[PDB]
């Protein structure tokens, strides 16, 4: 496997920060004036994690259509991925309002609601069944239906309810709960597992509208769950799948939203989970 020739030669010459900074160099650069408004201040978690105006996701209201969301449309893979921050204590509604809108089937949240002391997005959903959510600024009411918890992630069901309309949508919530506080994990089985278990359940295919995908600034886990699974379909379908190009990938993805994979380490798991899950894409 050439991939897996080239990841034993960055690690015997024990250069992954020289990659890493290649890649950074390289990245597209694109506006962001829409994040920087005053007015959206207080929507944004991450003062330099912002989306691009021209891949943004728009509110469908005439007040203030800003989140901080960001569309990645891979066009050859034919995947759509919609990758945002861990949601603020303003931004909930608006987090919701964009699922709805987007009419998608799945949620996958790679982080804990606290890591390393401090909170890292908003408890967004309802830990009960008889305590449901009601989003009064978007008209929105969220109730927990069931949830599964594995010792690796938890999977749940929701009932989104447009208050307006009285329509109702089932929503999947796929939570990976075990990554580490500090770093990446030691083996990429556990997260290919949940890669393989979000795709099971239907919420990647194209019936449905994008997956929505978040950690806290939606850019380092998140970059590599996307990276991961494009990598992994366009091995199935090219005649060639030696030609598959994780550096080349990577970068036509930071064209949609900056600084996706925020750490050469990020950068190697993402080799090892490809060449890995690979094993599988060769039939075995
Ligand atoms: C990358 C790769 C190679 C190779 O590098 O030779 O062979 C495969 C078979 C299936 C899926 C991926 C691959
Ligand atoms: C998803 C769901 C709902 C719902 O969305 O209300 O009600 C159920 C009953 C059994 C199994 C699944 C479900």
């Given at each position: 496997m050439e991939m897996e020739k080239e990841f034993e030669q960055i690690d015997k010459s024990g250069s992954w920060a020289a990659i890493y900074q290649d890649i950074r160099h390289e990245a597209s650069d694109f506006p962001s004036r829409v994040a920087k408004?005053?007015?959206?201040?207080?929507?944004?978690?991450?003062?330099?994690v912002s989306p691009f105006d021209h891949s943004r996701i728009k509110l469908h209201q005439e007040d203030n259509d800003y989140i901080n969301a960001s569309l990645i449309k891979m066009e050859e893979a034919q995947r759509s991925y919609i990758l945002t921050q861990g949601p603020l204590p303003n931004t909930v509604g608006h987090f919701w309002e964009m699922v709805w809108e987007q009419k998608s089937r799945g949620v996958v949240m790679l982080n804990r609601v606290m890591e390393k002391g401090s909170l890292?997005?908003?408890?967004?959903?309802?830990?009960?069944?008889?305590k449901e959510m009601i989003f009064e600024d978007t008209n929105l009411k969220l109730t927990l239906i069931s949830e599964d918890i594995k010792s690796y992630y938890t999977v749940r069901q929701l009932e989104l309810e447009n208050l307006t309309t009285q329509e109702t949508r089932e929503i999947l919530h796929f939570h990976y709960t075990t990554?580490?506080?500090?770093?990446?994990?030691?083996?990429p089985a556990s997260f290919l597992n949940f890669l393989f278990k979000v795709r099971e359940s239907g919420?990647?295919?194209?019936?449905?509208?994008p997956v929505v995908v978040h950690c806290?600034?939606?850019?380092?886990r998140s970059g590599t769950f996307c990276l991961a699974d494009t990598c992994l379909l366009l091995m199935d379908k090219?005649?060639?799948?030696?030609?598959?190009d994780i550096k080349k990938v990577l970068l036509e993805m930071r064209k949609f939203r900056?600084?996706?994979?925020?750490?050469a380490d990020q950068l190697r798991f993402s080799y090892l989970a490809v060449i890995e899950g690979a094993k599988f894409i060769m039939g075995d």
């Amino acid at each position: 496997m050439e991939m897996e020739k080239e990841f034993e030669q960055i690690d015997k010459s024990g250069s992954w920060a020289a990659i890493y900074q290649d890649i950074r160099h390289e990245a597209s650069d694109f506006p962001s004036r829409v994040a920087k408004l005053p007015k959206n201040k207080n929507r944004n978690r991450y003062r330099d994690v912002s989306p691009f105006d021209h891949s943004r996701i728009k509110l469908h209201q005439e007040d203030n259509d800003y989140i901080n969301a960001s569309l990645i449309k891979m066009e050859e893979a034919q995947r759509s991925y919609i990758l945002t921050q861990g949601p603020l204590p303003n931004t909930v509604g608006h987090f919701w309002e964009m699922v709805w809108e987007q009419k998608s089937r799945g949620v996958v949240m790679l982080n804990r609601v606290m890591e390393k002391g401090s909170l890292k997005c908003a408890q967004y959903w309802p830990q009960k069944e008889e305590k449901e959510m009601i989003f009064e600024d978007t008209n929105l009411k969220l109730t927990l239906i069931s949830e599964d918890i594995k010792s690796y992630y938890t999977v749940r069901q929701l009932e989104l309810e447009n208050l307006t309309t009285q329509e109702t949508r089932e929503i999947l919530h796929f939570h990976y709960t075990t990554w580490p506080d500090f770093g990446v994990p030691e083996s990429p089985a556990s997260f290919l597992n949940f890669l393989f278990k979000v795709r099971e359940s239907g919420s990647l295919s194209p019936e449905h509208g994008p997956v929505v995908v978040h950690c806290s600034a939606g850019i380092g886990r998140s970059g590599t769950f996307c990276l991961a699974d494009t990598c992994l379909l366009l091995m199935d379908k090219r005649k060639d799948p030696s030609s598959v190009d994780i550096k080349k990938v990577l970068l036509e993805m930071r064209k949609f939203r900056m600084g996706l994979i925020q750490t050469a380490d990020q950068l190697r798991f993402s080799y090892l989970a490809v060449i890995e899950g690979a094993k599988f894409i060769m039939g075995d």
